Design a protein that fits this description.
Chain B is an alpha+beta fold. Chain B has one helix at residues 5-26, and strands at 32-39, 44-50. In chain B, a hairpin with a 4-residue loop joins strand 1 (32-39) and strand 2 (44-50). The chains are: A alpha+beta, B alpha+beta, C mainly alpha, D mainly alpha, E mainly alpha, F mainly alpha, G alpha+beta, H mainly beta, I mainly alpha, J mainly alpha. Chain E binds chain G through residues 4-11, 14-15, 18-19, 25, 47, 50-51, 53-57, 89, 92-93, 96, and chain G through 11, 23-28, 33-35, 39, 41-45, 47-48, 50-51, 54-56, 58-59, 62, 73, 77, 110, 112-113, 118, 120. The structure holds geneticin and magnesium ion (28 copies). Chain I binds one RNA strand through helix 1, helix 2, helix 3, helix 4 and helix 5. The PDB classes it as ribosome.
RNA sequence: UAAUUGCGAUAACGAACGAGACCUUAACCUACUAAAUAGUGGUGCUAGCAUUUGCUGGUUAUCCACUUCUUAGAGGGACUAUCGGUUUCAAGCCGAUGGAAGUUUGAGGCAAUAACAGGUCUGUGAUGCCCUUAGACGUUCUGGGCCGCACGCGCGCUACACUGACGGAGCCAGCGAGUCUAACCUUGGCCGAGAGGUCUUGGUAAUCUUGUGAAACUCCGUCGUGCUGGGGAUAGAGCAUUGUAAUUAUUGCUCUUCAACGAGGAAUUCCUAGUAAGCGCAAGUCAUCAGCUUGCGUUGAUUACGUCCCUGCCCUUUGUACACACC
């Protein structure tokens, strides 16, 4: 056990599934008494695509715009090596992309 | 590896589609109703939801 | 090319003696005196501010304004 | 190209001096759109084959 | 006026008028009255303002247009004809210029002088297109007070702009000549002429 | 800048380079009614001839007028960059020329005639009087010759 | 810790942050004194909030503002809203209330919105034309 | 020249094929206590003050 | 009282400072000056002829003084402007680099600007000396 | 224009009918009343109901209304 | 009423799809939980002015504090509320005050029954039938063509200038997007009149490019009404960039050449508020090429708050020999 100064990055398209896992990480750690920079939310990027609806060129020009919403979150902890490998192999979610790094760079 | 977060997330939804298709073509006679992919450590898990699993 | 591009000392003398009575002078009003074009009409707006005559009450490029001295 | 410039009967002057034909100005006018709801199959169908099918 | 300073100084004439009188670029909103009955409540003049810009929302309700400060309406109609749309900085600068010309000739708070050119240039009665059967005849009609101000504004501006086109004279100059000539109507102004010809064709067809 | 006075010393419409030049305009736009002199090349030679540009074409001492010309025909000697020049890398002697005035039309023709005498397509295009730069001829240019 | 309040004002996309603290009466915007500002026709629009409540009024307070967003004019409407707003905020939390409400009364009576953010916001362009309302053009035939 | 000033006392309706005219009853100001129905051009609300070029004349319909 | 250059309106500053570097005679004007334009997106060279290098450098210094550090690249986009494509719409374009660079390399060898860390150029401390000096002078003419 | 859809005026009708006690001429309290007493799927819709039951209540005090 | 939206009339009563509701996005939250990938004040370290103090910077951690401003979770807020007008004495409507906001708050996504021989077999490894299938209508390669020019038409771009061009100088956005077998976004440094070149560098990105220091615009001057310094078509000569390949000139740059156009006939398009109009930017195309599109913000008005005259459509009634429904 040594205090490793950790940075976790949560990124997903599903808000409920993202803030579930984030708030889950926030209470599971802080009931368990560590040093936390809580969920720090990053500007949700909206990736847009603009298309004509019709497959061919006939008809009035109807444009449609699809979008995909990417929400990104990051949580800073300092823990020992044991609660990191435990908290990060569990809390696994489909659709949430969890990233755990040790370093500032 | 080392892809943008953006391109990654759009690359993930491209994957689901191609798989969704492949299973709709392959398993049609088995009653394939759709898929979901859970990415884990060490594995990636593919769940076929189909009405006759024994021919799967 | 129509006229009034240079000096013609009579027109110098015309200017000094003809610009009282002008409650407003500008680059327009100085060509409307059947006289110099906007290049030397400006010049005269300077040289009439050399001493006496024109009191600036306005500012800048395009619109200029002056009144007679008191 | 040696043939190209040696050719009179060419160029802008010789085009400028020709009359423009009528077929240019005129509209395409469509056609046939009167007849649109009248099938040219000349066949039609049968109450039998519409009930066997549907 | 009891001057006061503090760390970053606010200058002499700046301080002076400022706290004291609410007046214009500098021009008196006191005095300056509307020479015509009606036309008040449709010519603004108190509340006083400093420069002709505003964020004003006058376009959301029918008659709030009237409450817009009169000079600002004028500089409003100044910025238009294509290229000159937007560009209120341009048009406001001209208004300060023309009023400095207006006062230059015949004193007379230039704000008052436009109040007159706007009151004299509203046509009292006009004509409309009524069928009258077949070939359309024209029923003479008494024009509303607001309209009388609108048209007044547009006419003067349109004239000045049309007038300033393609000659050495400057927009601020020609804005003044017209304003003055229409202030006490000379019929040497493009507005006075066309206020009188709408009322002349209004007398004939009545 | 100042009011000036002079005398009958200034003469309007002086002629140079076989062309005629309005006086009573500012001296730079005067030298440009010649063929081969645009606003830039005017502006550089005047600065190179040590001449006050605030002057009109009028005052402009005759000696000032012979330096203006000398510089014009010999730009590389008085140090004009030779990218500033209309005609570089001759295609026969490969010197760098500023071709001027009544000669501008001459060199133009010879250029054209080369493309023509050579059977160049670009030549054929001038010779039929059409657009050489490639542009769509189907629509534009119907008032034509 | 000196008495300090911090306010803002908005016009379109322009936001201007105003620090109003206890000071000797400096008024500067961004890096520069309130006396430049240079649209310069609109110079009085930024003078306005002072000379509406009286010039004095500011000598027990330092005034700093910094602006980002919008254009040359948009910013000018935001700093005047952020200067007016901050004055009432100060007299809110430091001087008495009847004085603050005599400051708002002196503004809101004159307004130009000094205390109230103008909600006008750009409309979305919709396909079929260059602007939000204005459609392209048609020829029929 | 006989200018006559008249205050709008009621809004009536819009007339004309185009509908760009408004029927109005006024009470003219000097020596009130007589009523006339005139036709307006621009927009009018109650209490507006109208300049009648000709004192007595009035209309009804418009096409 | 105290003074910084942010106490003086932009133009009278950069003018008095231009006239100051004109008087000065410590310059390094590259000599292609006057035979040049200052943008690929400009019609004519500048109208101040002899001068205008001291106009731009004066501005350059003023710009750099305000903010942390500014490269040649930033200067280009700044000093650039609308280029008329003729019959085609207007597009913004970067001004000429050699102008503003040798404006830096001249303000360096005059000790008014220095290479910064992080990149760019940074206002020399002898620059804030001189600048906040003539910026004092300019409200001294206005006294 | 501002008109209340049937599903708004049918709820309000259904409310004042059973709940006429409580249910006063103040929207705000009436608003919260709705939350406890009724299940409505959106903030917007609920307030629409409440704000109308307020109008109806408000003129009931001035004498009965049809329906 | 935006609405078969409602009131009301009532042999009907009470209801369902559609409208509404709903969802997304923009406006408001001195309070919720936080942020060296967002900033603020304090304190050190420190530069410059002047000042007995004070002003302006600089500083990736040097520490301490905070969440107004920036970010996004979850809540809250408007229901046309209060009051007054106006009406069947009704749903509603106008006005006022308040308010972030009172045009369905602004803007959209979704969208009943049906209709059409509308468009699309040139998006598809969607498809019936026909056609072809080895001298191929499969496919690849080489080279042209789709750009070809007496002319007719449509969407546009630039202009006729003095509300301007040109030269300095001032100097402000928002939506965006960016690179591993790879060459993407590119700060900075030097070379170059330019265009560009070159050595490095930060960025798989709230971290770097980027405050995308955009343009219109503001100010000080030069031009001074002259097809002019408005206008830049046409054309010559040269220098660069992409690409295997630039000729019929991909694009870019410098000199030169310097047309029509002096406000557009009959006509006809679009539009009501942060709109119209001016202005640029990013994204899509994409090696290179935007006068194009999709979005964005910057400047920011005049004039309606009506009618049924025109036109278009919906709705009653009326006639019919139509029902493959006036083709
Ligand atoms: C000066 N030469 C070129 C210069 O013209 C310019 O070209 C880009 C071009 O490469 C871009 O090509 C594009 O291709 C990628 C890719 C994922 O498809 C896009 O993400 C992105 O829009 C852009 N980088 C284009 N969209 C804009 C031009 N200005 O910038 C790149 C360059 C090599 O410096
Ligand atoms: Mg003019
Ligand atoms: Mg020439
Ligand atoms: Mg710029
Ligand atoms: Mg510029
Ligand atoms: Mg152009
Ligand atoms: Mg429904
Ligand atoms: Mg500090
Ligand atoms: Mg906050
Ligand atoms: Mg009521
Ligand atoms: Mg068909
Ligand atoms: Mg198809
Ligand atoms: Mg087929
Ligand atoms: Mg096929
Ligand atoms: Mg095709
Ligand atoms: Mg086909
Ligand atoms: Mg396709
Ligand atoms: Mg398919
Ligand atoms: Mg056609
Ligand atoms: Mg189209
Ligand atoms: Mg300019
Ligand atoms: Mg950032
Ligand atoms: Mg920004
Ligand atoms: Mg010309
Ligand atoms: Mg030109
Ligand atoms: Mg191409
Ligand atoms: Mg296209
Ligand atoms: Mg109606
Ligand atoms: Mg028939």
């Amino acid at each position: 056990q040594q205090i490793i100064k950790i940075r976790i990055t949560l990124t997903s398209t599903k808000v409920k599934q993202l803030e579930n896992v984030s708030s889950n990480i926030v209470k599971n750690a802080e009931q368990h008494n560590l040093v936390k920079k809580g969920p720090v939310r990053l500007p949700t990027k909206v990736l847009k695509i603009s298309t004509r609806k019709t497959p061919n060129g006939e008809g009035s020009k109807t444009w449609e715009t699809y979008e995909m919403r990417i929400h990104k979150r990051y949580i800073d902890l300092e823990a020992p090596v044991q609660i990191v490998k435990r908290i990060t192999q569990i809390t696994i979610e489909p659709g949430v992309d969890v990233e755990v790094v040790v370093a500032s760079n | 590896a080392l892809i943008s977060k953006k391109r990654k997330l759009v690359a993930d939804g491209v994957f689901y589609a191609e798989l969704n298709e492949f299973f709709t073509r392959e398993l049609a006679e088995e009653g394939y109703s759709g898929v979901e992919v859970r990415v884990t450590p060490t594995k990636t898990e593919v769940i076929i939801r189909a009405t006759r699993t024994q021919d799967v | 090319a129509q006229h009034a591009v240079i000096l013609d000392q009579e027109k110098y003398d015309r200017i000094l003696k003809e610009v009282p009575t002008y409650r407003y002078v500008s680059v327009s009003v100085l060509v409307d005196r059947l006289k110099i074009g906007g290049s030397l009409a400006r010049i005269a707006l300077r040289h009439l501010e050399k001493e006496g005559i024109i009191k600036p009450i306005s500012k800048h490029s395009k619109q200029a304004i002056y009144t007679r001295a008191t | 190209n040696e043939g190209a410039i040696r050719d009179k009967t060419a160029g802008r002057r010789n085009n400028r001096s020709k009359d423009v034909t009528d077929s240019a100005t005129t509209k395409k006018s469509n056609t046939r759109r009167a007849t649109d709801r009248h099938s040219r199959t000349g066949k039609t169908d049968t109450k039998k084959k519409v009930n066997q099918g549907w | 006026f009891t001057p006061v300073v503090l760390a970053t100084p606010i200058p002499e004439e700046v301080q002076q008028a400022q706290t004291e009188i609410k007046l214009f670029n500098k021009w008196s909103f006191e005095e300056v009255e509307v020479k015509d009955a009606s036309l008040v409540d449709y010519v603004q003049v108190r509340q006083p303002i400093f420069v002709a810009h505003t964020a004003g929302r006058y376009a959301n309700k029918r008659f709030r247009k009237a409450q817009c400060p009169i000079i600002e309406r004028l500089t409003n109609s100044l910025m238009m004809n294509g290229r000159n749309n937007g560009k209120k900085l341009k048009a406001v600068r001209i208004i300060k210029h023309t009023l400095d010309i207006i006062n230059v000739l015949t004193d007379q708070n230039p704000i008052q002088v436009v109040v007159d050119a706007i009151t004299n240039t509203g046509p009292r009665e006009d004509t409309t297109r009524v069928g009258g059967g077949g070939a359309a005849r024209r029923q003479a009609v008494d024009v509303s007070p607001l309209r009388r101000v609108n048209q007044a504004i547009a006419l003067l501006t349109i004239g000045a702009r049309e007038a300033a086109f393609r000659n050495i004279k400057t927009i601020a100059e020609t804005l003044a000549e017209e304003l003055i000539n229409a202030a006490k109507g000379s019929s040497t102004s493009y507005a006075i002429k066309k206020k009188d010809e709408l009322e002349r064709v209004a007398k004939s067809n009545r | 800048s100042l009011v000036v006075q002079e005398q009958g010393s200034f003469q309007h419409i002086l002629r140079l380079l076989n062309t005629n030049v309005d006086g009573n305009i500012k001296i730079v736009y005067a030298l440009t009614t010649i063929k081969g002199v645009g606003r830039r090349y005017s502006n550089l030679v005047c600065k190179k001839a040590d001449v006050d540009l605030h002057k009109r074409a009028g005052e402009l001492t005759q000696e000032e007028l012979e330096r203006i010309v000398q510089i014009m025909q010999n730009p590389t000697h008085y140090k004009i960059p030779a990218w500033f020049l209309n005609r570089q890398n001759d295609i026969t002697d490969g010197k760098d020329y500023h071709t001027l005035a009544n000669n501008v039309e001459s060199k133009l023709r010879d250029d054209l005639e080369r493309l023509k005498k050579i059977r160049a397509h670009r030549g054929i295009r001038h010779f039929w009087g059409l657009r050489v730069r490639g542009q769509h001829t189907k629509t534009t240019g119907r008032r034509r010759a | 810790a000196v008495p300090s309040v911090q306010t803002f004002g908005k016009k379109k996309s322009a936001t201007a942050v105003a620090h109003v603290k206890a000071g000797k009466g400096l008024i500067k915007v961004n890096g520069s004194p309130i006396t430049l500002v240079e649209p310069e026709i609109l110079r009085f629009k930024v003078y306005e909030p002072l000379l509406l409540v009286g010039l004095d009024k500011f000598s027990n307070i330092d005034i700093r503002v910094r602006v980002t967003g919008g254009g040359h004019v948009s910013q000018v409407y935001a700093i005047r809203q952020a200067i007016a707003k901050g004055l009432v905020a100060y007299h809110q939390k430091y001087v008495d209330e009847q004085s603050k409400n005599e400051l708002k009364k002196a503004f809101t009576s004159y307004d130009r919105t000094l205390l109230i953010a103008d909600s006008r916001r750009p409309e979305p362009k919709k396909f079929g034309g260059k602007g939000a309302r204005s459609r392209f053009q048609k020829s029929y035939r | 020249t006989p200018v006559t000033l008249a205050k709008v006392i009621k809004v009536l309706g819009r007339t004309g094929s185009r509908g760009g005219v408004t029927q109005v009853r006024v009470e003219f100001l000097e020596d009130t206590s007589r009523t006339i129905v005139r036709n307006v051009k621009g927009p009018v609300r109650e209490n507006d003050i109208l300049v009648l070029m000709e004192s007595e004349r009035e209309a009804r319909r418009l096409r | 009282p105290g003074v910084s250059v942010r106490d003086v309106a932009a133009q009278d500053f950069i003018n008095a400072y231009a006239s100051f570097l004109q008087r000065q005679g410590k310059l390094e004007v590259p000599g292609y000056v006057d035979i040049v334009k200052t943008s690929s997106g400009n019609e004519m060279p500048p109208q101040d002829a002899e001068g205008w290098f001291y106009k731009r450098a004066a501005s350059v210094a003023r710009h750099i003084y305000m903010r942390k550090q500014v490269g040649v690249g930033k200067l280009n986009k700044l000093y650039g402007g609308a280029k008329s494509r003729g019959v085609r719409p207007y597009k913004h374009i970067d001004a000429s680099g050699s102008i503003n660079r040798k404006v830096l390399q001249a303000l360096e060898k005059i000790g008014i600007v220095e290479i910064s860390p992080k990149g760019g150029r940074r206002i020399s401390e002898n620059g804030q000396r001189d600048l906040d000096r003539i910026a004092a002078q300019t409200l001294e003419e206005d006294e | 224009g501002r008109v209340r859809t049937k599903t708004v005026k049918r709820a309000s009708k259904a409310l004042i009918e059973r709940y006429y006690p409580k249910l006063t001429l103040d929207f705000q309290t009436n608003k919260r009343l709705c939350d406890e007493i009724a299940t409505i799927q959106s903030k917007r819709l609920r307030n629409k109901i409440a704000g109308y039951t307020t109008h109806l209540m408000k003129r009931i005090q001035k004498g009965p209304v049809r329906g």
